[model samples]
Target chain A: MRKIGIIGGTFDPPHYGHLLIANEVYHALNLEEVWFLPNQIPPHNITSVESRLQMLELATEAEEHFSICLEELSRKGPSYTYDTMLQLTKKYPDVQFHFIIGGDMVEYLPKWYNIEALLDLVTFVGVARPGYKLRTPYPITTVEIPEFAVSSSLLRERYKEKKTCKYLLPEKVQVYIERNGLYES
Target chain B: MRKIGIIGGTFDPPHYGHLLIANEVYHALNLEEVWFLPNQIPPHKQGRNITSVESRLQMLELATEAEEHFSICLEELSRKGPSYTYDTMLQLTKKYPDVQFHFIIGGDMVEYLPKWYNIEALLDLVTFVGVARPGYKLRTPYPITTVEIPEFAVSSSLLRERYKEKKTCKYLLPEKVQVYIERNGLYES
Candidate 1:
């Protein structure tokens, strides 16, 4: 089976650390490709300062392993994993799908919409975070790489403070930020 | 004093996490500006697959910070710091008179560079990597701000391997690498 991975995030301005983790996971799992799916309306990030399309473009511009999947971004309402997975399975039936999620998100796996069905459809690649403890009783394989405790919000705050974001993003996206004034507010 | 922070590295390919840390340091220290200096010839990385200065220059061009001080690239030989901190410092001071050179270095300082002279000159504004870890005594009066980086040694080579294979690098870096690799056809090999 062709192993494929999915890394979904708001990607407010996709940083180096996020790309590193996703790449590490991909090699660790020996997956063929990884897709970075940006949510149009993330269920939890209604208050997120970044827009879905802008993040999608910036993320697409940063990593080659990342292919922007607009299935979630194109959806009308809040994005749920189940809906996105269902669509992916239908579109790419031959590829084995693994959903890359943080350890904290995995803790609430049982609470996700259509949890059982979603689990049945795609494999879960849970990455461990700094303070989050995993409590899943389900028989799912977990790949723990070194946890990167950085957050998009923190990065945004740094940009707001007029600080150097040099190594935080691909230079291309950094230039884009200055040109468009994405987060200059 | 007009504090100017200098973050030196190959910056083989600048990323968002590095930017975030520099951003944090610039504000936290209330420094006038920060400069991301790309080392022309990093001693340790001499044999590794180093990216060209031209590529790095483009990467730096894309990753710009408003409070960032973009210094003209000073050749390693010209700076006299082919490997020593003192040499790099001396060269930097000759050009920049008004701003204090706040050297931002990572790794265990006491263990890394033990027997260097004129310690006071470098200590004028020394930012040590392991300031947060206990028991690492630093003998400098300049304020040392300790930043807790998410992980140690997450370099571009590691990111490149995964990108070449089209693997998931999730939290190790921002999504920017994926985009850059794809756009440049970097690892199609």
Candidate 2:
């Protein structure tokens, strides 16, 4: 049986923080692979879906066990974790999927659509985040990752202000953003 | 003249903590390049177990290959005796006549400046740069440049212990370095 870790996010220019979390959970759980599942819904269409996917690809391409999963992108309806995991579990019954999220995201678990059913499909892994407490009743394997305070919103803000975003994200992703004039008005 | 930041360490296994310090200092000082000098054999650690110089260099290369400004300086590795900063700086300055080297150290190392070999002469050859580390006070009588970086608890010793215990050192090290460690069975006691 294959063990897989899943991280679902908008990934609008994925930063080191996201990669660090996914990488930590992947090793902590002895996962075969960690799939970077990019969310279909872009916030206000700030960045194109293709660009977001490309940046995620750039960020994860170095690791042999890390790859991009396009199941959510190809779906027709609303991109819900329960809906995605339901289809995924049915398709790959032999594989055990470990869904990963930061401590900040763990707080909103109560509002998730079909949270209970989603829990049954995948093993939830919560990565410790700074300034946020990880407190959830759901069964989650906690992994301690280093505190690298990087975010997409912060990256976008730096780009708009004409500041260098070097080392904040993957070097290739930063180059791609600059070459294509991304995150700038 | 070119500005270069030099960080000398055992680099038994270079982790992100080392990289973070080098990178922070590089940007903070607007350096042209940052050199990672791996020691041949530490003076204080005479009987301690250490990885081979080749293994240390290979790991350092794998860890620093991505960064454009990061490079490995093999001056200390070629020397016969235990690595000394004073000797390394004397040779480095002579070798690179047009470069101004900034020798970087952690806050913990700052307190030990008086014990260093030929301290007064070494200070003349290279400027000492002290980087912040958690729980280590940056108090020294000597004049030094200081760079403030976020305190991180990861260290090479901590990583080696984790590997010895069969624990995952995932985010603390580069993915490539961790893969190399597994392939070579390093730090597995």
Candidate 3:
């Protein structure tokens, strides 16, 4: 089976955090590819899907394994992790999916809708973040990673206020966010 | 003192591996910037696949333009020698007095660590980070920190070879870099 990593996020301007974390996971696990899924409708989404996806394009332009999948964006209603995983597994039945999450989310697994079914669909690869208490009953594998906290919600505010987001996000994403007047509405 | 990560490599043609590793070192160490040093000249400078300095710099800039903390440091390019890390560290120390430096090297360079001239001096100046391969039996006996980075086994030569065979290398490097390579006939030889 072709090993693959699926990292879904509100990308709201994908930052340096995701780029590094995702890269580490790719190499560590020897994944064939790591696809960035920009959530068109997630819990905290506050920007257009087009803009977030474009930012992802700029940030990941140089990476070979980093690709974008917009399957969720095309679908209607609130996007759920389980839904993405189910459909992805069905489409590529031969591929092994490693559903990635932050080390912090190990504690929040129960909150995800259809947690057990999602667990069956894919193996969870939690990128270890410092300062998070990792807890889970399931056999979850974690990669040791540096704890660099770049708050996406806070970043959205900064974009809205026209404040500096400097190193929090990728420079290309920052420029794109600026050029499009994102969060101005 | 601002924390800075110094990633020095031939970068004969920088690629994705360099991009991810440097970024990890930056935030892991809470560095202000991870300066990409493309070796103008090196001790083991073999192979004709060595791309031009200008092309190397241009590709690096574009790949890192997305990254704020990743910038090119050009002093090493002008300093002609074996491009030894010892001398490079010495010059950088005097230049950036207020900078705390961390030198990052890959698994391939571990053998050369002890052989470096003024090894102790280089050790005194900055923290040495040895990028390690996934599975290794060798216990690195040196004053350095080991970071387990993924071994993709991807190389500039492989990319060049694939491109020469008319394979699509657009995904391997940046669009700007691929365009420049296609335009200038770099690595396509």
Q: Give the number of the best model, judged by TM-score.
A: 2
Off by over 4 Å in 1: A42-55, A58-62, A129-134, B1-189
For model 3 chain A, where is the 10-residue window of minimal lDDT? A129-138
List DockQ, one per candidate, in order: 0.01, 0.01, 0.01
Model 3 chain B: which ten-residue window has the lowest total lDDT? B41-50
Deviation in angstroms for B140 in model 2?
A: 2.8
Give TM-scores of the second chain, every candidate: 0.68, 0.91, 0.86
Error of 1 at B78 (Å): 72
TM-score of predicted chain A against the true chain A, for each candidate: 0.85, 0.92, 0.88
DockQ of candidate model 3: 0.01
Instruction: Give the candidates in order of TM-score, highest first.
Output: 2, 3, 1
List model 1 lDDT by residue over A83-175, tens digit each. 788988999899899888765344334435566688778888877543222334444556666655454545555566666677766776666
* Model 2 vs. true fold: TM: 0.49
lDDT, candidate 2, B1-189, per-residue tens: 899999877676899988988999999999999999877652322243457778989999999999999999999788764445777788888899999999997654553455355676888998999876432224345778888887675666457767777777889899999999988888884
For each candidate, report what fraction of the true interface contacts it reproduces: 0.00, 0.00, 0.00
Query: Candidate 2 has which clashing residue pairs, if any?
Result: none
Tens digit per residue, CA lDDT, model 1, B7-29: 76555456665676666667767
TM per candidate comes to 0.46, 0.49, 0.47
